[PDB]
Design a protein around this ligand. Structure first.
Ligand SMILES: CC[N+](CC)(CC)Cc1ccccc1
Ligand SMILES: [Mg+2]
Ligand SMILES: [Mg+2]
Ligand SMILES: [Mg+2]
Length: 340
């Protein structure tokens, strides 16, 4: 039963969940990967890994992905969560030096992952492994796009570092711009393409219907995370959250902020439903009877289909994952799955 302040009837009724058939194998392989890359201690992997549902949320997103593609995505995604934890700890413990070096190392590894497969920082080595594997599915032009997008993500994380250190809470739209980078909107959008086995030409993926559908899918995911992770983040002195920016700069109460974030989230759904029709019509138009046309049509259709899947997967993930179960922690400021 989903808490009323987090419940979205439209999602529950109109966005039925899907699960990739590779998930059972996925859950086990990523867990083993986390262990062997030493991204989490053995006892914490044993106790928390499965309950974090990191593989689950991705397996409910990129439907149709080749098992190998989904595996790389899941490993990368699990790494991403751990990176978020490391980022959080560096801020809390004021490790500005350690963060700056990690920041620089990630930028470097992003462009040449093979060179960093066995770096002394296991977080860097774990990153390099997943990225190298992600770079082996599509042409280098896609790899370059992934890199360009993630370079931006890293810098957004750096801005978060300075914000929390200086105690600055970003403005609403200042946050809204930043959130598209810290949530890595365009990374997940990029990853739709190897999942459907086709790098989309710019003319296709920059089609206004495709762009808008892709954007709304991510805005929902990011803002719903804000809604659900708000108590966790308030307790952990995190300042990056749409609700927090509303409390700080719009004089809204916690109750008012939650309500406003809900409405913005709900509006994302109905805006998506409208543009989804245009995006799917675009997919039909691509099928002009040619082999290339059918390929592009099928890829767009699958991608838009997964844009929709993101809604339900992210929705249920926040209610199933132990990551946000702050009420069950002895110390609300310090999640038990994080290395403190
Ligand atoms: C750290 C949060 N995360 C995980 C990869 C990176 C920005 C986004 C996310 C949050 C919740 C569900 C899915 C993805
Ligand atoms: Mg974060
Ligand atoms: Mg976080
Ligand atoms: Mg959050």
């Amino acid at each position: 039963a989903v808490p009323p302040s987090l419940r979205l009837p439209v999602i529950e009724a109109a966005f039925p969940r899907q699960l990739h058939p590779y998930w059972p194998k996925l859950q086990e392989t990523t867990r083993t990967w986390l262990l062997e890359k030493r991204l989490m201690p053995a006892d914490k992997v044993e106790e928390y890994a499965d309950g974090l549902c990191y593989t689950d949320v991705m397996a409910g997103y990129y439907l149709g992905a080749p098992d190998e593609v989904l595996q790389a995505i899941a490993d990368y995604s699990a790494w991403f969560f751990v990176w978020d934890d490391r980022h959080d700890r560096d801020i809390v413990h004021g490790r500005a030096g350690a963060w700056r070096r990690l920041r620089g190392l990630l930028h470097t590894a992003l462009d040449s992952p093979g060179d960093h497969l066995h770096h002394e920082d296991t977080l860097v080595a774990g990153f390099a492994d997943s990225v190298r594997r992600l770079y082996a599915f599509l042409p280098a032009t896609w790899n370059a796009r992934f890199a360009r997008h993630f370079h931006t993500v890293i810098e957004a994380y750096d801005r978060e570092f300075h914000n929390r250190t200086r105690g600055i809470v970003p403005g609403v739209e200042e946050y809204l711009e930043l959130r598209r980078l810290t949530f890595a909107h365009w990374i997940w959008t990029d990853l739709l393409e190897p999942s459907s086995g086709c790098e989309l030409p710019d003319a296709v993926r920059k089609h206004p219907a495709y762009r808008r559908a892709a954007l709304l899918s991510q805005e929902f995911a990011a803002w719903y995370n804000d809604l659900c992770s708000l108590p966790k983040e308030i307790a952990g002195d995190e300042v990056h959250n749409l609700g927090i920016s509303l409390i700080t700069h719009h004089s809204l109460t916690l109750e008012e902020a939650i309500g406003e974030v809900r409405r913005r989230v709900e509006e994302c759904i109905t805006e998506f439903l409208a543009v989804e029709r245009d995006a799917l019509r675009f997919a039909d138009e691509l099928a002009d009877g040619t082999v290339r046309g059918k390929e592009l049509s099928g890829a767009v259709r699958a991608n838009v289909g997964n844009m929709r899947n993101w809604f339900s997967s992210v929705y249920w993930f926040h209610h199933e994952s132990g990551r946000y179960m702050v009420d069950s922690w002895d110390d609300r400021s310090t999640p038990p799955y994080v290395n403190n």
